[PDB]
Amino acid sequence: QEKKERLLREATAIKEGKKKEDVSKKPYTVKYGLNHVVGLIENKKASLVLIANDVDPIELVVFLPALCRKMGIPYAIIKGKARLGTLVHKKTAAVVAITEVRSED
Amino acid sequence: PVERTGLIRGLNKGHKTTRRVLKERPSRRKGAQSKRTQFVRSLIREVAGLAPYERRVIELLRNGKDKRARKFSKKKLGTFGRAKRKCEELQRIIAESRRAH
């Protein structure tokens, strides 16, 4: 829904002749998806990594603590891939990561 | 490239042509090591460890029986070249461990 009003507002802005960056601000969301989080860890953009404790198959996340230790990323194993899914509006999330937050946080 | 002699036999035989230098075909880049591939392989190596036959070759090389390690590596792998490369990389592993310690 929020994406729908955002695209409608950007459509009105581009109708009256303004860029989408003029009406939309820089987003700050929780990064998720295993390949995305692995890429962020490898590029040292992630500031904090949370890894679910019950990923089946376990080979998807068995290297993530060692990768975080090599790249100097603060990582933590937490209980509940469904608990992370409630964050990321999914049923299941194997790993989530914070790259940047707002100035208030 | 070396110029051909223009004869039917001997060394550098063949019809004389102006040979070209050509840009290397990207299909021939296979076997070159990439930075990401090196990083991933090193991380997976330190995560997983060694095989039992690799540990046997490691302790043979620690004892100094190079010929016995080569023979055991050939018996385990199958070919002399693969055995030699395996012994070389395990000797590199031993050297890295001893320079760490």
């Binding site: 890429g39 490898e42 590029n43 040292k44 790249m71 | 930075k35 990401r36 990083f39």
Partner: peptide, 8 residues
């Protein structure tokens, strides 16, 4: 940092 490819 390990980069898979150059990023625009």
């Amino acid at each position: 940092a390990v980069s898979v490819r150059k990023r625009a």
